[PDB]
Design a protein around this ligand. Structure first.
Ligand SMILES: Nc1nc2c(ncn2[C@@H]2O[C@H](COP(=O)(O)OP(=O)(O)OP(=O)(O)O)[C@@H](O)[C@H]2O)c(=O)[nH]1
Ligand SMILES: Nc1nc2c(ncn2[C@@H]2O[C@H](COP(=O)(O)OP(=O)(O)O)[C@@H](O)[C@H]2O)c(=O)[nH]1
Ligand SMILES: COc1cc(C(=O)c2c[nH]c(-c3ccc(C)cc3)n2)cc(OC)c1OC
Ligand SMILES: [Ca+2]
Ligand SMILES: [Mg+2]
Ligand SMILES: [Mg+2]
Lengths: 332, 427, 54, 437
C-alpha cells in the first residue's frame, strides 16, 4: 500500500489523479501534514522541498520540480533566454522581449530603429502601440511584467479570420524523460481579428476565460488536433506534424534541456516530476513562437481522463509499481 | 545505577517472586545466590538489581512487604526463596481484608515505618540509586493501600528519584471480592500523582490471553503470572544488559511521558507462550513485529485501534538482523501512520539485545503509551459507580475512618484522567 | 581564471583561484541565571513537600 | 606556534574525540604510549603538530584535550582503552548521573554543579600554552549533556577567554541512530544560547553519514564506530592545516575570515570524497577531476541539501594526496560550465585551495580504503538552512501541544526560553533567505 498526500485542492489535474490513485486499491490518502508519505501532490507556492527525502524507509516523490519557476515566470523566462548560452544566438522562436520595472534603455534602442524603420511596432504587457502608453500602465500596476513584441501577422483560421494559441501538455518524469502529450488544444478567438486598433481587446489574446461570438465554429473555443490537422491539409496542403509540431518539439526540448542541470533530481534524496503547459502561437508563415510556460496547467475537459491516467502510468507507477503510449518521447 | 525493588501484598509478592526467579536464571544466579553462568555480559549490569555479599554471592535488592505472613512464608519456602535477605521480610499479622483503607490508613500505618527503614538501608549501600520499582495489585488491600502509602512516603524522602510500578488491574473475570473497583480507583488516584511510569497489567487481558490464545480452559494465577514474569523480564532487559542507549529509568520517563499524568503504559509480549509447552519454530522478525503490535498480545485489555500512540518503546531479544528489525519497525509506522500522533515526530524507539530469554530463540517486548488505555480506567470507573451510587459496601471503609468525600474525589481524578487521554486522541 | 597567492613548501601548496570578482553576557549575568533556575526548582520542591505534609 | 585546545562534551563528543585523536596519532607517527620517534626536539618545541600536542621531558606527546561527560561509562572506556596512556587523568572529567536527554538538566541543574571544575581543568591546559588560539568543541545537538552543558560551557569560555576563537563540531540529530524523542528541542535550545559564542560550526547530520556508510561502504547497519571513523576523517582534513605546514587556514581566525563573512551565518557545509570500501576487491583510483566533481553531489555532503537552490558566500578545497594546482584549476573549469554555482553578488566567485601531499591515513582494519588522493570541500551555502527548516518544523509540531515541556520546566527552565530560542531560529531562517535570493 503506497501512501500520498494532497496539498493543493484547487488542482483540477491532480484532484483527478487522486481519485485514479484511490481507485487502484493500492494507494491510501493521508492527512496533508502527515510526513509518512510516498508521494506529495504539493502546494503551488512555498512548497517545502527541504523536508522531502528525510524519512527512513520511504521513497518520496513530488509532482513539482524545484527550480522550474525560472521557466514559468515571464520575467525569469525572458532572463533565462537572453543569458543562457544554450539559447540566445539561435533563439528564432522567442519574441524580442525586455524586463521592465515600475520604480529600458536597451528597450528604446530597438523601438528607435523601429521608429526610423517604418515597420510594425506594437508590443504587449494588455496592449498598446505607443511606448509610453504602457509605461504609464506599468508604473500604476505596482508589480513587474515583461514588454514583448506583439505578433502583428498571425496565422488566421478560416472561415472567420480567427486568432488562436496552441497549448501543449508536457510531462517530465523522475529520469528527466520528456513526454509530450499527443493531444494539444487550439484556444481560438470566436471573434474576427482586427488590426486597425488595439482598444478592442477581447479578439487579440485568446484566453479560455476572457471570452466571457462564442462557440460558433467549435465547442468552447477548443479545436483539437485532428480537425486542425485536417484544416491544414485542406487549406494549406500540409500536416500539423511538419508545419508546426517539429518546432514545438524543438522548443520544448530546448527549454527543458537548458534548465536540466539546475532542476534534475537524478542523484537526489527525493525525486521530482512535473506537468507543464507550453503556450505557442503560429504566424502566417507557419512559424511557431513560444508565449509562456505554465507550471501548474489545467487540462481541457475532453482530455482530463486520458492525460491524468498517463501521469499515473508514466510518472507515478514507474517509481511505485502496482501488482499503446499516449505520449511522444522527446529524445536527448 | 541501582534500583530498589519492593513487592507488597499477595499478588505483588507472587509476581515479584516469579520476577526474581526469571532474571536470576538469565543472569546465571542459582537459588543459593552463587553465579555459575558462562558469559561476562550476565554480570556487567548485575549491579542494577543485585547487591554483592561476602563470598561473592548476589543478593536481590528486594524488599518483601505484606500485612499477613501467609504469602511471604510461601515465598521463603519457594524455589528461589533463600536468595532474599531475611532482614528484608517486613510483615504484619492482622492482614488487610482486601480493604484499601486498612492498607493506607490503619493497619499499614503501623508497619510502614519499618519498611522505610529497610528501604533506607538498601539505599545507603547504593553507588548512585536511580529509583524504585514496586510490584502490587490494585484490587486488594496491602499492595493497593499500603503500596500507595509507601510510594507517597518514598517520594517524601527521595523526591528526585524515579518511581516505577508494575500494577495489576482487577477484573471481574479474575475477581476475589466485589470491592476491587473501590480499591483500584483509590489507588489510581495515588499512581497518577506519585509515579513516573506505571505498567498497567490487566488481569482481564491476562485471562483472555490464557483462555483464547494459549488454549487454557481454566487458567490459574500461576498461568497469569507466567505472562507477567515474561513481560517484566522484557521491559527490564535494557536495564540488566548493556546496549547502545545506556538505558535507565529517567530517560525512559522523559521520552515516554509527554504530559506528567499520562504515564500508564500498555505492555505487550511476543511470542505468547504457556508454561511447560515449548516453542519449536522460531519467529521471523516480521512475525515478531506483527505479533508485538497485535491487540491480542497486549497485557492491558484495550483496543489500540480505539486510540492513538503518543510514544512506543520496543525491545527485541535474540540474534537477528538489526537491518530487518529497522525495516519492520519502520514498516508498521509507515503502514499505520494514522495511529501515531503526528505532533510527536519519530515517537517509536527500538532496542535490540543479543541474549534471548529462557526457552525462546527470539522475543519482542512492547511498551505503548496509547490513549486507548482510557478504556481500562473507564471500565474501572463504571464498576465503581455502579456501587457508589448506592453507597454499597462503603461501611468497610467508613469503619476505618474514611469519608464519602475521598471516594468522590478519587472518582473525579480518574474521570479527569480519562478525559485528558481523550483530549490528545483528537489532535 | 586568476591564480593568486601561490605558496609552496615541503608538505604541499595553497592558492586562491578567482573565476569572477564581486558584482556577550557577563559572569554575574550567568550566575544569576543558574541561580534563578535553582530557586525555581527549590520552590517546586517546597510545594511538593507542603502537599505531602497536607 | 599557537596552541589549540579540544573539548569533547557528552557521549557523541567523547567518542568522536577518540576517533580523531587515534587518527591524529597515526598521521603524526605518535605511538599509543605517547612517544614520537620523528620528534628530535625532546621535551618541547613549536612545531606545527605542537598546536595539538604538548610534550613531557620523557618524550610523551599528550593531546591538548579535555573530555567531559555527566556520566562515566563512555570516558571510562577511554580510561581503559588502547590510548589510556596518552591522556593525563585530569583531562577526563565524569559526573555520576547524566542529563537524561534534557537540555535544561544539563545546562541548569547538573551543569551549575560541575562548570567550575571543568573550567579549572581547561585552565590547566591553557596555562601550558605560550599563545593559545582558542577551542574546538565536539558535541551532539540531541543529548542533554551535548546540548545543555556545551551551551553553558560556551557561555563561560567567552567570559574567561573572550579573546579566543571557538569552533564547533556538532552532530545534527537523525532518527535512524538517535536516542531521544526530544532532540529537536535540545537542538533549538543549544543553537540559540550558543549562536553568538561560536565563530564557526561544522554541522554533521548523522543521516548523511549513515547513508554514506550504507552506500559507499556496503555496511548494512552502521554503528557509531562506523560513523565516527568516517567523521574523524572529515575532521582531520579540516584541522590538518592547523597541525601541518601550510599557508591556508593556519589559524582559527582564518576559518572565520575565509568561511564566515556574516557572523550569524557560520555553518559551512562540508563535502568529502572519495569514500571507498576496504573490502572492495578491484578499485579504479579516482582522479582530481572525479573527486572534485564529487564535491558537488549532495550524496557526499555532511548534510543533505541542494546547493543549486542557494548561494555561496565562500568555498574552500582541502586536498590530501597526489594533487597539483594544474589539475585543480583544470577540474574547476570543467565543473564551472556544467554545474549551478551561484555566489552572492558581494563576494568573489572563487575557490581557496590547500594541498597536503601526504595521502589520507586510515585506521588499520577499518572500513575506509587507502586512496591516492582525497578532498574535503568547505562551502558556506545558504542551502544548509534546509537542515534548520527540518529541525524547526519538528520543534513546532511538538511545542504546539507543549509536549514534554514539563520535563524542562521541572529543571528550573522557564517556558519562555522555548519561544525565545524558537524566535532566534526564525530570525536565523530569515537571514539565510535574504542572502539566498
Ligand atoms: N555520529 C555520532 N553520533 C552520536 C554518537 N553518540 C551519540 N550520538 C548522537 O547524539 C545524540 C544523543 O546525544 P548523546 O551525545 O548520546 O547524549 P549526551 O551528550 O551524552 O547527553 P545525555 O543526555 O546526558 O546522555 C543522538 O542523536 C545520537 O545519534 C556517536 O558516537 N557518533
Ligand atoms: N495476576 C495476578 N493477580 C493477582 C494475584 N493474586 C491476586 N491477584 C489479584 O489482586 C487482587 C487481590 O489483591 P491481593 O494482592 O490478593 O490483596 P493484598 O494481599 O491485600 O495485596 C485481585 O484483583 C486478584 O485478582 C496473582 O498472583 N497474579
Ligand atoms: C528503563 O528501561 C528502558 C530505558 C530506555 C531508555 O533509557 C530510553 C532512551 N531513549 C528512549 C526512548 C523511548 C521512547 C521514544 C519514543 C524515544 C526514546 N528510552 C529504553 C528502553 O527500551 C526502549 C527501556 O526498556 C523499557
Ligand atoms: Ca618536540
Ligand atoms: Mg488475595
Ligand atoms: Mg550520555
Amino acid at each position: 500500500m503506497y501512501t500520498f498526500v494532497v496539498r493543493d485542492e484547487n488542482s483540477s489535474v491532480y484532484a483527478e489523479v487522486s481519485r485514479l490513485l484511490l481507485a487502484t486499491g493500492q494507494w491510501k490518502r493521508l492527512r496533508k501534514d502527515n510526513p509518512r508519505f510516498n508521494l506529495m501532490l504539493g502546494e503551488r507556492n512555498r512548497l517545502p522541498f527541504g523536508r522531502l527525502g528525510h524519512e527512513p524507509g520511504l521513497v518520496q516523490l513530488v509532482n513539482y520540480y524545484r527550480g522550474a519557476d525560472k521557466l514559468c515566470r515571464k520575467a525569469s523566462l525572458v532572463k533565462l533566454i537572453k543569458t543562457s548560452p544554450e539559447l540566445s544566438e539561435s533563439c528564432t522562436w522567442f519574441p524580442e522581449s525586455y524586463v521592465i520595472y515600475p520604480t529600458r534603455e536597451v528597450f528604446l534602442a530597438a523601438y528607435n530603429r523601429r521608429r526610423e524603420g517604418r515597420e510594425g511596432n506594437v508590443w504587449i504587457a494588455l496592449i498598446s502601440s505607443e511606448a509610453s502608453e504602457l509605461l504609464d500602465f506599468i508604473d500604476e500596476q505596482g508589480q513587474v511584467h515583461v514588454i514583448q513584441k506583439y505578433l502583428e501577422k498571425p496565422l488566421l483560421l478560416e472561415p472567420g479570420h480567427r486568432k488562436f494559441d496552441i497549448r501543449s501538455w508536457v510531462l517530465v518524469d523522475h529520469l528527466y524523460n520528456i513526454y509530450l502529450y499527443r493531444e494539444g488544444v487550439l484556444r481560438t478567438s470566436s471573434e474576427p481579428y482586427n488590426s486597425a486598433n488595439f482598444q478592442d481587446k477581447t479578439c487579440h489574446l485568446t484566453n479560455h476565460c476572457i471570452q466571457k461570438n462564442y462557440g460558433r465554429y467549435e465547442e468552447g473555443n477548443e479545436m483539437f488536433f485532428e480537425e486542425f490537422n485536417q484544416y491544414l491539409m485542406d487549406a494549406l496542403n500540409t500536416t500539423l506534424e511538419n508545419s508546426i509540431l517539429l518546432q514545438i518539439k524543438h522548443i520544448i526540448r530546448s527549454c527543458l534541456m537548458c534548465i536540466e542541470p539546475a532542476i534534475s533530481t537524478k542523484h537526489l534524496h527525493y525525486q521530482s516530476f512535473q506537468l507543464f503547459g507550453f503556450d505557442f502561437m503560429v504566424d502566417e508563415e507557419l512559424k511557431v513562437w513560444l508565449i509562456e510556460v505554465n507550471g501548474a496547467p489545467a487540462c481541457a475537459q475532453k482530455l482530463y481522463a486520458e492525460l491524468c491516467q498517463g501521469i499515473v502510468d508514466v510518472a507515478i507507477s514507474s517509481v511505485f509499481p502496482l501488482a499503446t503510449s499516449i505520449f511522444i518521447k522527446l529524445h536527448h | 545505577r541501582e534500583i530498589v525493588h519492593i513487592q507488597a501484598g499477595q499478588c505483588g509478592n507472587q509476581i515479584g517472586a516469579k520476577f526474581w526467579e526469571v532474571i536470576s536464571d538469565e543472569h546465571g544466579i542459582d537459588p543459593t545466590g552463587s553465579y555459575h553462568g558462562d558469559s561476562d555480559l550476565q554480570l556487567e549490569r548485575i549491579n542494577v538489581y543485585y547487591n554483592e555479599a561476602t563470598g561473592n554471592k548476589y543478593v536481590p535488592r528486594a524488599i518483601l512487604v505484606d500485612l499477613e505472613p501467609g504469602t511471604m512464608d510461601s515465598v521463603r519456602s519457594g524455589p528461589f526463596g533463600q536468595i532474599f535477605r531475611p532482614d528484608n521480610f517486613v510483615f504484619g499479622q492482622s492482614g488487610a481484608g482486601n480493604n484499601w483503607a486498612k492498607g493506607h490508613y490503619t493497619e499499614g500505618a503501623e508497619l510502614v515505618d519499618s519498611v522505610l527503614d529497610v528501604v533506607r538501608k538498601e539505599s545507603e549501600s547504593c553507588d548512585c540509586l536511580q529509583g524504585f520499582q514496586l510490584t502490587h495489585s490494585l484490587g486488594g488491600g496491602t499492595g493497593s493501600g499500603m503500596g500507595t502509602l509507601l510510594i507517597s512516603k518514598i517520594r517524601e524522602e527521595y523526591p528526585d528519584r524515579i518511581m516505577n510500578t508494575f500494577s495489576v488491574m482487577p477484573s471481574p473475570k479474575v475477581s476475589d471480592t466485589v470491592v476491587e473497583p473501590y480499591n483500584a480507583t483509590l489507588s489510581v488516584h495515588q499512581l497518577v500523582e506519585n509515579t513516573d511510569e506505571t505498567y498497567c497489567i490487566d488481569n482481564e487481558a491476562l485471562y483472555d490471553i490464557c483462555f483464547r490464545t494459549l488454549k487454557l480452559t481454566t487458567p490459574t494465577y500461576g498461568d497469569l503470572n507466567h505472562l507477567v514474569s515474561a513481560t517484566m523480564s522484557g521491559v527490564t532487559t535494557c536495564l540488566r544488559f548493556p546496549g547502545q542507549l545506556n538505558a535507565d529509568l529517567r530517560k525512559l520517563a522523559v521520552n515516554m511521558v509527554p504530559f506528567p499524568r499520562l504515564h500508564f503504559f500498555m505492555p505487550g509480549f511476543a511470542p505468547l507462550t504457556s508454561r511447560g509447552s515449548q516453542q519449536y519454530r522460531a519467529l521471523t522478525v516480521p512475525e515478531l513485529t506483527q505479533q508485538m503490535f497485535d491487540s491480542k498480545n497486549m497485557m492491558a485489555a484495550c483496543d489500540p485501534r480505539h486510540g492513538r500512540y503518543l510514544t512506543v518503546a520496543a525491545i527485541f531479544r535474540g540474534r537477528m538482523s538489526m537491518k530487518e528489525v529497522d525495516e519492520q519497525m519502520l514498516n508498521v509506522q509507515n503502514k499505520n501512520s494514522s495511529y501515531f500522533v503526528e505532533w510527536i515526530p519519530n515517537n517509536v524507539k527500538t532496542a535490540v539485545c543479543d541474549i534471548p530469554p529462557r526457552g525462546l530463540k527470539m522475543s519482542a517486548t512492547f511498551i505503548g503509551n496509547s490513549t486507548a488505555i482510557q478504556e481500562l480506567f473507564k471500565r474501572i470507573s463504571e464498576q465503581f459507580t455502579a456501587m457508589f451510587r448506592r453507597k454499597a459496601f462503603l461501611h468497610w471503609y467508613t469503619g476505618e475512618g474514611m469519608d464519602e468525600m475521598e471516594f468522590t474525589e478519587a472518582e473525579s481524578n480518574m474521570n479527569d484522567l480519562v478525559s485528558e487521554y481523550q483530549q490528545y486522541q483528537d489532535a | 581564471m586568476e591564480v593568486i597567492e601561490l605558496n609552496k613548501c615541503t608538505s604541499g601548496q595553497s592558492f586562491e583561484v578567482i573565476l569572477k570578482p564581486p558584482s556577550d553576557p557577563s559572569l554575574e549575568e550567568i550566575q544569576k541565571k543558574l541561580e534563578a533556575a535553582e530557586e525555581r526548582r527549590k520552590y517546586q520542591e517546597a510545594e511538593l513537600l507542603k502537599h505531602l505534609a497536607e | 606556534m599557537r596552541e589549540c585546545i579540544s573539548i569533547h562534551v557528552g557521549q557523541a563528543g567523547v567518542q568522536i574525540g577518540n576517533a580523531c585523536w587515534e587518527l591524529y596519532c597515526l598521521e603524526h607517527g605518535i605511538q599509543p604510549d605517547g612517544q614520537m620517534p620523528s620528534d628530535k626536539t625532546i621535551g618541547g618545541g613549536d612545531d606545527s603538530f605542537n598546536t595539538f600536542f604538548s610534550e613531557t621531558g620523557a618524550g610523551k606527546h599528550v593531546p591538548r584535550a579535555v573530555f567531559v561527560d555527566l556520566e562515566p561509562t563512555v570516558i571510562d572506556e577511554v580510561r581503559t582503552g588502547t590510548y589510556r596512556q596518552l591522556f593525563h587523568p585530569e583531562q577526563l572529567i565524569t559526573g555520576k548521573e547524566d542529563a537524561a536527554n534534557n537540555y535544561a538538566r544539563g545546562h541548569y541543574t547538573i551543569g551549575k554543579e560541575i562548570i567550575d571544575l571543568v573550567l579549572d581543568r581547561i585552565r590547566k591546559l591553557a596555562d601550558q600554552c605560550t599563545g593559545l588560539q582558542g577551542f574546538l568543541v565536539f558535541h551532539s545537538f540531541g543529548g542533554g549533556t551535548g546540548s545543555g552543558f556545551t551551551s553553558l560551557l560556551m557561555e563561560r569560555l567567552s567570559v574567561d577567554y573572550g579573546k579566543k576563537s571557538k569552533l564547533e563540531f556538532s552532530i545534527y540529530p537523525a532518527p535512524q541512530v538517535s536516542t531521544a524523542v526530544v532532540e529537536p528541542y535540545n537542538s533549538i535550545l543549544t543553537t540559540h544560547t550558543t549562536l553568538e559564542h561560536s565563530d564557526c560550526a561544522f554541522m554533521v547530520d548523522n543521516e548523511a553519514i549513515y547513508d554514506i556508510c550504507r552506500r559507499n561502504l556496503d555496511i548494512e547497519r552502521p554503528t557509531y564506530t562506523n560513523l565516527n571513523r568516517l567523521i574523524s576523517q572529515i575532521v582531520s582534513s579540516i584541522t590538518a592545516s592547523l597541525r601541518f605546514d601550510g599557508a591556508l587556514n593556519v589559524d582559527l581566525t582564518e576559518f572565520q575570515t575565509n568561511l564566515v563573512p556574516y557572523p550569524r551565518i557560520h555553518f559551512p557545509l562540508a563535502t568529502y570524497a572519495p569514500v571507498i570500501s576496504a573490502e572492495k576487491a578491484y578499485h579504479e583510483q579516482l582522479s582530481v577531476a572525479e573527486i572534485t566533481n564529487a564535491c558537488f553531489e549532495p550524496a557526499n555532503q555532511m548534510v543533505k541539501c541542494d546547493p543549486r537552490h542557494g548561494k555561496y558566500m565562500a568555498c574552500c578545497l582541502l586536498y590530501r594526496g597526489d594533487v597539483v594546482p594544474k589539475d585543480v584549476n583544470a577540474a574547476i573549469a570543467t565543473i564551472k560550465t556544467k554545474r549551478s554555482i551561484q555566489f552572492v553578488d558581494w563576494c568573489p566567485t572563487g575557490f581557496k585551495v590547500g594541498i597536503n601531499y601526504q595521502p589520507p591515513t586510515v585506521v588499520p582494519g577499518g572500513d575506509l580504503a587507502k586512496v591516492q588522493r582525497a578532498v574535503c570541500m568547505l562551502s558556506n551555502t545558504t542551502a544548509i538552512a534546509e537542515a534548520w527548516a527540518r529541525l524547526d518544523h519538528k520543534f513546532d509540531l511538538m511545542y504546539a501541544k507543549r509536549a514534554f515541556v514539563h520535563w524542562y520546566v521541572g529543571e528550573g527552565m522557564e517556558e519562555g526560553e522555548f519561544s525565545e530560542a524558537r524566535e532566534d531560529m526564525a530570525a536565523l531562517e530569515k537571514d539565510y533567505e535574504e542572502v539566498g535570493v
